[PDB]
Amino acid sequence: RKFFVGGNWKMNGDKKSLGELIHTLNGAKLSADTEVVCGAPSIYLDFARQKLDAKIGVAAQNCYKVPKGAFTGEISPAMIKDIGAAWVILGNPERRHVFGESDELIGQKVAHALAEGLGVIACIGEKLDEREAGITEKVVFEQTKAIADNVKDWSKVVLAYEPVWAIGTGKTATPQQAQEVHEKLRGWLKTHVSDAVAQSTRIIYGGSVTGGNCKELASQHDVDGFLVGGASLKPEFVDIINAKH
């Protein structure tokens, strides 16, 4: 499995500051072996695909579930492809817990994005109350089944485990905590889809990944990369891409 690190810029940047971040990425010494994609604000997706080196992929941060229509404020897979982006982030925890996107809606958006030929980074993760009650497995298998039941071709899917308690809080999961759920999710994939899908699907981790903690997390056997939030706006993102070196 090719190591994968995605950078989600979230609602951050303007053209001057994302211009200099992109200039750094294009000039950096990036691992020949890592697949990198940057998740840009929708208003800057065209700019970011025009400015980033072709080797780095561009991801939309959300999309809707039909190609066109009376959905003010939404963008579709067809428009993302039009600009030249190749990925979309779906199911991100702010979209679930701030904006109220349900598992049934995220499942419909995955099926549509994939039918349009986009790659999908599908996000899953439990909240702290659920972790402390001992039901992390149940919650991530329920969210993963709602995505998987809508995936026909797994070659374009990357699973991203992001515990909600670790996003923006500095409370990174330990290598042992990350590895536990990544192994459990890989086992669900082998049992419910197939063994070939379980060994080829990248399952990445996000939630307070920094250049400081990424090598310990990257050496775990079922962690295939990272979905970087806050640190993807900094030069240390280059150290995270290179976390296997």
Add this chain to the structure above:
Amino acid sequence: RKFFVGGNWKMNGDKKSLGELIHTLNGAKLSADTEVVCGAPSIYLDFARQKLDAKIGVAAQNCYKVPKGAFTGEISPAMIKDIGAAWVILGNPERRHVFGESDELIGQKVAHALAEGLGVIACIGEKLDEREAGITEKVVFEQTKAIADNVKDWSKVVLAYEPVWAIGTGKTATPQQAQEVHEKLRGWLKTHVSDAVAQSTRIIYGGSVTGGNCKELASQHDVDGFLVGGASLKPEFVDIINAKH
């Protein structure tokens, strides 16, 4: 009050077809007494502001209530302004009824977009059940108060009355239906804000406006223009801009 018509492209277009729409608008003879603004998909805002003649305004179809942060999928007023767009549509019926945005959230978005120096097209409107129940006045005054509580300077605000039953259905409000609530809205503003604000605020109608419709609606005394959806993607958008000529 300068006659205002806004086109809301909603989730439609790609660069090939929107560039053609733009070329038509730039080439058309549009009345110099109409203020016109096009509401492009967020992915095409930068493209639209670059290709449109400077006399035509650009509006974002939605924004969030803070400058930056962990809100994947959202854009802020600072980003809209960075692209050079001058307006944002807020409170649109799809955002309220399909995406669940509340009066409280829309009010917070109005106050933040105006603070940031953007013009706001604030939409209000009742659903069919409320109109049949006879509570139109109760519903839109309630929504208007939510916006008004958050407006300090009305010179950058345009109220858009769009009955939900008239959006995308083909069922246009009659000239007399529209005039009756525009007039009640302008009186509400007179008693609750000031006579000067009631006199100078543009109240536009939206909901299945066409080239065929527009002249009789525009001749009503309190209808100051249009928010156009489906017909903003067509050549007849020019006739609607030119409705008083």
